[PDB]
Nucleic acid binder design. Structure first.
Ligand SMILES: [Mg+2]
Ligand SMILES: [Mg+2]
Ligand SMILES: [Mg+2]
Ligand SMILES: [Mg+2]
Lengths: 179, 105
RNA sequence: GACUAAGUUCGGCAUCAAUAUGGUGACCUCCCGGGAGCGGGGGACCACCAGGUUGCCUAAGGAGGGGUGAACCGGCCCAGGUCGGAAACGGAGCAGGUCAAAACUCCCGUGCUGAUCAGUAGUU
């Protein structure tokens, strides 16, 4: 069984909103997709859709928390909810990193899941402003994504590289607070 | 004319403090009538006179069993207490409350 | 036709909790002043609200938007009338007006969950 996490999220995200940052639409897209998936599907695993499903669960929460932060910009009561969604996003991501350690799923997918789990983990701690714990997660994420990138040609590694470029600002912010 | 007023609402256990009542429910009674009040006060030797046609301002029930006001004298108008047993309005009320029930029941 | 995920449409079910501060409404129990309506003040309890931290909290639980609040039951402003008053004025409160804050209820969001349409694709 196989699942290419970073590629999936990057293409779902860009097609249904995040081109313009519309986390509402994309989250909705995640919800509906999760409907289709469970409907089609309805013991560890059989197919690779289960893995796609749990990811959508982690994606929904994640996107929500992100919609929330655009909103809590003015509505600090929402910032409480933001942090809840984000903590939920990690719960589903952990639960995901739990499923991909079953031995009928390849190690490339194992890497993605622990890199994803690190990404979100990085995000939660970064929002709690836990700068050392957050930067640990951001480097863990950076380290694993760099590991994935070397094992492929430069073309395949482009996606991985732009994601580490993507989280590099986050890494930078944490640093100047532990100075 | 310098006598304390007393409404039956003050003693009615089926009324809230906001509805008039002046004494704790435990010591209060059910539906005391100005008549009942006058009778138990007078019978102890208090000077009391009954105003059959005064209504309580906070009283809303226009039927006779809740109308009435009982005026009581505490003082001989030299300032002294008519009786030493009854220095205060409260002392009156609590007693009436204590005595009304021995009548009908 | 079979598989893949989008699009179309109408339903059902459902929608956490704790802290600090202030607020509202009730209700209970004490004092104190008064010829009444009433005035001054100490505690106790309950309900709700605002918005400041949060969680052994969610499948998801906004600190949304509305409406009813009547034949008596919310709170407020209360014509008349009414009770108390010598009166001033006040009580209780109708018609009418009104609501951060009884209770009820719809909408939005959120979650699960039946279902619709095109025979639409992607690809056989
Ligand atoms: Mg008193
Ligand atoms: Mg509904
Ligand atoms: Mg109180
Ligand atoms: Mg509140």
């Amino acid at each position: 069984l196989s699942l290419e996490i970073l590629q999936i999220i990057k293409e779902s995200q860009q097609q249904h909103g995040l081109r313009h940052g519309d986390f509402q639409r994309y989250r909705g897209y995640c919800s509906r997709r999760q409907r289709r998936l469970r409907k089609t599907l309805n013991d560890l695993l059989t197919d690779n859709r289960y893995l796609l499903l749990v990811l959508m669960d982690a994606e929904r929460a994640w996107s929500y928390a992100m919609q929330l932060k655009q909103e809590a910009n003015t509505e600090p009561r929402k910032r409480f909810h933001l942090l809840s969604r984000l903590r939920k996003a990690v719960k589903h991501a952990e639960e995901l990193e739990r499923l991909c350690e079953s031995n009928r799923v390849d190690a490339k997918t194992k890497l993605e899941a622990q890199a994803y789990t690190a990404y979100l983990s990085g995000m939660l701690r970064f929002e709690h402003q836990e700068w050392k714990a957050a930067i640990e997660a951001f480097n863990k994420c950076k380290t694993i994504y760099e590991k994935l990138a070397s094992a492929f040609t430069e073309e395949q590694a482009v996606l991985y590289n732009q994601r580490v470029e993507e989280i590099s600002p986050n890494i930078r912010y944490c640093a100047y607070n532990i100075g | 004319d310098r006598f304390i007023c007393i409404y039956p609402a003050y003693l009615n256990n089926k009324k809230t403090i906001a509805e008039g009542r002046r004494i704790p429910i435990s010591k209060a009674v059910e539906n005391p009538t100005a008549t009942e009040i006058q009778d138990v006060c007078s019978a102890v030797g208090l000077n009391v006179f009954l105003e059959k046609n005064k209504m309580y301002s906070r009283e809303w029930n226009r039927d006779v069993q809740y109308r009435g006001r009982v005026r009581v004298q505490l003082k001989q108008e030299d300032g002294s207490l008519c009786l030493v047993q009854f220095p205060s309005r409260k002392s009156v009320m609590l007693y009436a409350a204590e005595m009304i029930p021995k009548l009908k029941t």
